[PDB]
Symmetry: C4
Subunit: 332 residues, 4 copies
C-alpha cells in the first residue's frame, strides 16, 4: 500500500529536487551529461556545433574576400588573384567553409597561394573540423554501446516464491537470459526495502537491508545459461526470519532484486533490476521447470518461465516459528 | 549417457524457444543484437544504410533539379544558374549524393549559391553522413575487439584427474595460456551439473553445484604464466565427497570449468569454458609436467599438456570412505 | 592542526619530488601521459603533428616539382606534363600537401600519372594521414570519456557524525548521487589517516588504517538511488574504539572516504573521494532525512543533505568505556 | 642459483614450445594477435590492406576503361562519354582508385553517368574503404590505449625486507605511483615460487604458493597516493613460517609481487609485476621514509624510495622458532 521504490521494469521510483549546484556540476561532468540525454538532443547538439563552425569560418572567408576585393572579381584574371576562388558573397563563403571542413572539397571554390591569412584559416578549420568530428564520433560510439540496454534481454520472474528446499524455508525468484550470448562474471544481490524506527527513535524513511544470496561463500556468482532460480534461505539472520504466510498479506515491504554482469561482446557491466512487493510474493509455491532434454541437446521453454504451482505441504509459519517449534518437539 | 550441457570447446548445449517478446526486446537492445550477428550480416546492414541514404538524397537533388529546370540546362549559362551543376538525370543526382555524403567530392557535379534548399540539403546530408559513419565505426570497433575470441588462445586439458596431493584426495584439471600476453585478474570456477530431486520431491532438471576451487581463501585467483593445475580438494562439503573410482564408471554427471580474466591489451573480460563428463575424468592419474628449466630461462613443452600417467598407489574409495576408515583405524 | 591528506573535494594533498627516471618512464607510458595533460596541450600537440607532416610532404612535393622543372611550367602543355599540376612554389606545394592529407582534394592542384615518385608520395601521405587521424581520434575519445568527472555528480556530506544506531556506537557519513543515471557495482571504503610509532620505534609518517564498512559481509556494496548513510560500527577492532567526544576536540587525525563504481553509460570505474578531519566529525548528531513519499513516488530534497541535528541522549564516552562500563554493571 | 621466473622489470622468464595449433588458434583470435605485434608490423599490415584494395579496384576500373574503349578517348567528346573521365592507362586507373577510396577526390579523374558497372564499383569501393578505415581506427585506438604501459609509472622497491612490526615478524616491499593520476581499485598479491615434491612423490617444477597480503580482511585493497609498504605477517600459515635469516643465504626461492588496478583515465586494468629472489630479501632492515610534511602539504622524496637501514634488534630466527621459544618461556 505504501509505494513502489523500484518498478518491475527496473526503473527507480524516486525524483530529486532542490539540488543547488546541478548546472555547474553537470558542466564539469558534461560528457556524462551528454551521453545521458536522448539521441535526438545529442545529435541536435552536434549538428549545432557543425553549423556554428561552418557559419563562423564562412564569415571569416567572406570578410577576407570583402577587404581583399574578391567579391567584385571572384575568379580573378591575369592581373588579379583572389584569396579563395569563386567566393561571390556570403552563400559562397559559407559553401567554401562547408566544403573545407567536411573535406568534401568540390573544388569550384578553392584556396589559392595568394593570402597567407586565407591559407592559415584553412589550416585552422581543417584541424578544428577533425576535433569536432572526433567528439561526435566519441559520443556516438559511447552512447551506442550503452550496456544498460542489455538488461532488456535479461529477465526476472513476475513473482517470487516461498517454499521448502532441501529442508530449509527459502525465498526464490527466477532470472534468465534471452540471448545466446553470455553474461560474463554475473552475480546477484537482493535487498529488503522498508521504513523503520531504530531503538533510539531514529526514523529511516527507507532502510535497505541485505538479503543473503550466498555472498560469503561466493554462491552469489552464477553461471547463467538456462534460467536459474535464486535462493534466499530464511534463517536466524534473514530479515524475513519472523515472517509467515499471514504476515505477507498484512505487511508492507518490498524486495529489490539485482543481477549484474558483463555484456559478452563489450565486456561492459550492465545492471538489471526488478522488484517484488509483499503482495507479489507467492507463499507455498514452486516454479514450473522450463528446461528439458531432447535427443542431442537441452531446450528452454520460455512460456513456463513465470509459471508456478501450489505446494500444499508447505509450512505456513515463520522460519522463526519453525525453528523454535522444532525445539519444543526435539526438547520433549 | 544423459547429455552434454557444455561442449569441450566451451559452447553451451541449450537452445531457447517460445520466447514471446524477443523482437521488441531485441530492438531496444539493438546494439547488442547488432554486434552479435555475423560479420557479413552486420556489414550488409551498414552498406544498406549507406545505399538507402544515397538513394534518398539523390532523389531529393533530382526533384530539385527537375522543378528548378536544371535537367534541361545542366551546366547553366550567363542567364541561368542550376541548383547543382551537371545533374542531368537520376544517375547524376545519385552520383552527386554519393560524392557529397562520402566527402569524395570530385567536383564535376557541384553545389551552387543559387538555391537555399539545395544548400540546405547539402548541410543535412553532410551531418547525416557523419552520423552513419560514426555508427559503422562504433559497431566495427566493438565487434572487432570481442574478448571471447581470446578464449581460443586459452586451453583446458582434455581430461580431469583424481589423485592424492599433499595427503588430500583432489580433482584436477589443467589450464594454460597459448600467448605471451597475459590474462589479467584471472580466476577459476567449476560446477557440477546434474538433475536431482530434493527431499520435498521437487525435480531440478539440471542443478548447478559449486565446486570449491579456493574462493573463500582467494586461491581461485591465479597468476597464469605456464600451465597451472587447478585443484578441488574433495572433502566433507564437496559434492564429490561420496564418489569413488567405481562410482565414476556408473554415474552420469558433468563438471563445468570456467576461467575468467581480462585480455591484457584491452583489459576486457573473457570467459573460457570447458567440460568434463564423468567418463572424461581419469581416476588415479597425474598430469605430465610441461615445464622445465634451461640455462637462462624456463620453457613449456606443450605436447605434454594433455598427457597423464597412472599412479597405482591412489586409493580407489571415496573421500568419505577414506575419512571414515581413517576413524576405524584411529579409533581402534 | 597537522595537515589535510585529502581535500574535501577529493583532491590529494601530496606532491612528488626527486623522481629520477620520470621522462623516460613517461615516454614509454606516453599515452597515459598524453591523456593526463590539459585539453589545450593535447590538442596543441596534435595540431603540431598535422602541421609538421603537411610541411614535410609539402617540402617533398616542392622538391619534386623543382627538379622535374614544374615550377616554371605549372600547368603543362601538349609537350610537357608536371608531376603535380599547379604547384608554382612552396605555398602551392604546402596547399597540395594539406589537400591530400586532409582528403579535401579541391583538385586545382592535382597528381598526374607522370612521376612514379609523386604518385608514391601521395600513397605514403594518405596512409600517414590515416594513422595520425586515428591517433587523434583515439586520444580525444579516451580523454573525453574520463570517468573521474562522474565524481562531481557524486556527493559526500560535509560532516561525518557519531551516534547510536541499533544499540551500537557508529561513525556515519552520507553519500548521494546527483544524477538519475546509476553507479553500477558501487561500494565504499574508508581509512583513518595519521602518523604513528610502532612498538619497535619505527616512525610511519602517515599510516593508513582500514575503517570497516562491511567488507567481510559484503555490506560495503551499496545500491545507491537516494542518499545512503554509510555506517562504521565502532567496536573492539575499530581504530576509533577508544575515542570519546573529548578525544575528538583534542586529537589530530583524518578519515578518508571513498566511493567506487561504474558510470552507467560507459561501465567505466570512477573513484570519488572526500575527507573528514577530527574537527569535521560531529559527536552526538544525526543526519536530517532527505527522502519522503508523495502520492505516486518518492522524492529527495537535497537541501537537507548536509544537515544534522543534535541527539543529546548520545553517550559521550568511547566505545571502549561503553563496553567495559557495561561489564561493571552486568558484573555487579 | 636456480633461475628467475619473473624479472625485476615484471617480464616473465618462460618461453612456449611445441604448441601445435597456434596458427589456426591465432587466426580465430586475430584481433588479439594483431594488437600484440609491434606497431611497425601492425601498420605495415594496414598499409598493405590499403595498397591491395587500391590496386584491385584500380585494376577493375582499368579493365572497364579498356573494354569500353576509354583508353583511346580519355576525356570523351560530343559523340562519346567514358565510364570514368581521364583514365588513360593503369597509373590513372590506380590514381582514380586511390582518390575514390581515400575520398580525396581531386576530380580530374571522375565518374560519369555512363556505365552502371563503373558507378556500381564506386559504390562498392566507398563502402569497402569505410570498412578498412574502421578496422585501422579500431586497432590503433586499442593498441594505443594499452594499460600495461601504465605499469612503468608504477614502482616496486628493488629489495624486500624482513622486520618486526607491531610485535609480528613481517615481509615487506614497497609500491609507489610515479604519476599524480590515480590507480583505481588497486590491490596487491604475492606468491612464493619454487619447485617441490609432494608427500606422494609428485614433482611440481614450479609451485606457486600464496603469500597472504590481507585478502580475507580486504586489506589487499590499497589506496595508493604516496608509497605504501606492503606487509606479509609471517605466521602459522605463511610458507615463510620456518625460515630464518640464515635459511635466506642458503635456500633458493623467489617471491613474485603483483599490483593490479585501473588506469584512472581509461578505467582499464593494468598489472604491474616484480620479483624478489631470496638473495634480494634483506633480513633485519626497514625502509627509509619518503614522506614528509611542509607548511601547506605533504611531499614524497623519491630518492629515499629504495633505501633501507639496519635494525640490529631484529630477531634472527624463524617465526616458528619465535613462536615455540615464546612457549618455552611462557611455559616455565
Ligand atoms: C536522424 C536523427 C534522428 C534522431 O535524432 O533520433 C531518433 C532515434 C530515437 O532517439 P530518441 O530521441 O527517441 O531517444 C531515445 C528514446 O527516448 C528511447 O525510448 C530511450 O530508451 P528507454 O526507453 O529510455 O530505454 C532512449 O534512452 P537513453 O538510451 O537515452 O537512456 C533515448 O535515447 O535515435 C536513434 O535511434 C538513432 C537513429
Ligand atoms: C568484405 C565483406 C566480407 C564479409 O562480409 O565478411 C567476411 C568475414 C567473415 O565473417 P562471417 O560472416 O563468416 O562471420 C563470422 C564467422 O561465422 C566465424 O566463424 C564466427 O566465429 P565463431 O566460429 O563463431 O567463433 C564469427 O562469430 P561471431 O564473432 O559473430 O560470434 C562470425 O562473425 O568477415 C571478416 O572477418 C572481416 C573481413
Ligand atoms: C579549440 C581549442 C580549445 C582548447 O584547446 O581547449 C579549451 C577547453 C578547456 O580545456 P583546458 O585546457 O582548460 O583543460 C581542462 C581544464 O584545466 C579543466 O579545468 C580541468 O578540469 P579539473 O578542474 O582538473 O577537473 C581539466 O582537467 P583534466 O580533465 O585534464 O584532468 C583540463 O583538461 O577544452 C575543451 O573543453 C574542448 C573544447
Ligand atoms: C610511421 C611508421 C612508424 C612505425 O611503423 O612505428 C614506429 C613506432 C615504434 O614502434 P615499434 O615497432 O618499435 O614497436 C614497439 C617497440 O618495440 C617498443 O619498444 C615496445 O615496447 P616494450 O619495450 O615492449 O614495452 C612495443 O611493445 P608493445 O606495445 O607492442 O607490447 C612495440 O609496439 O611506432 C609508434 O610509436 C607510432 C609512431
Ligand atoms: K574536387
Ligand atoms: K572503448
Ligand atoms: K570471507
Ligand atoms: K574527403
Ligand atoms: K574530398
Ligand atoms: K574533393
Amino acid at each position: 500500500c505504501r509505494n513502489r521504490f523500484v518498478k518491475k521494469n527496473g526503473q527507480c521510483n524516486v525524483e530529486f529536487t532542490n539540488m543547488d549546484d546541478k548546472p555547474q556540476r553537470y558542466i564539469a561532468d558534461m560528457f556524462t551529461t551528454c551521453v545521458d540525454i536522448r539521441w535526438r538532443y545529442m545529435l541536435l547538439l552536434f549538428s549545432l556545433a557543425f553549423l556554428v563552425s561552418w557559419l563562423l569560418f564562412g564569415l571569416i572567408f567572406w570578410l577576407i574576400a570583402l577587404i581583399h576585393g574578391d567579391l567584385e572579381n571572384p575568379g580573378g584574371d591575369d592581373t588579379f588573384k583572389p584569396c579563395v576562388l569563386q567566393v561571390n558573397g556570403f552563400v559562397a563563403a559559407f559553401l567554401f567553409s562547408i566544403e573545407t571542413q567536411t573535406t568534401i572539397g568540390y573544388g569550384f571554390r578553392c584556396v589559392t597561394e595568394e593570402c597567407p591569412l586565407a591559407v592559415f584559416m584553412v589550416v585552422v578549420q581543417s584541424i578544428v573540423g577533425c576535433i569536432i568530428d572526433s567528439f561526435m564520433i566519441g559520443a556516438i560510439m559511447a552512447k551506442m554501446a550503452a550496456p544498460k540496454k542489455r538488461a532488456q534481454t535479461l529477465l526476472f520472474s513476475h513473482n517470487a516464491v516461498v517454499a521448502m528446499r532441501d529442508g530449509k524455508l527459502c525465498l526464490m525468484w527466477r532470472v534468465g537470459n534471452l540471448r545466446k550470448s553470455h553474461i560474463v562474471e554475473a552475480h546477484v544481490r537482493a535487498q529488503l526495502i522498508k521504513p523503520r524506527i531504530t531503538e533510539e527513535g531514529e526514523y529511516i524513511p527507507l532502510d535497505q537491508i541485505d538479503i543473503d544470496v550466498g555472498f560469503d561463500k561466493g554462491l552469489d556468482r552464477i553461471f547463467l545459461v538456462s534460467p536459474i532460480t535464486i535462493l534466499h534461505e530464511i534463517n536466524e539472520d534473514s530479515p524475513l526470519f519472523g515472517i509467515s504466510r499471514q504476515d505477507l498479506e498484512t505487511d508492507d515491504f518490498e524486495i529489490v532484486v539485482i543481477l549484474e554482469g558483463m555484456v559478452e561482446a563489450t565486456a561492459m557491466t550492465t545492471q538489471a533490476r526488478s522488484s517484488y512487493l509483499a503482495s507479489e510474493i507467492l507463499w507455498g509455491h514452486r516454479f514450473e521447470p522450463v528446461l528439458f532434454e531432447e535427443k542431442n541437446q537441452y531446450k528452454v521453454d520460455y512460456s513456463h518461465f513465470h509459471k508456478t504451482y501450489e505446494v500444499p505441504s508447505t509450512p505456513r509459519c515463520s522460519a522463526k516459528d519453525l525453528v523454535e517449534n522444532k525445539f519444543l518437539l526435539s526438547n520433549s
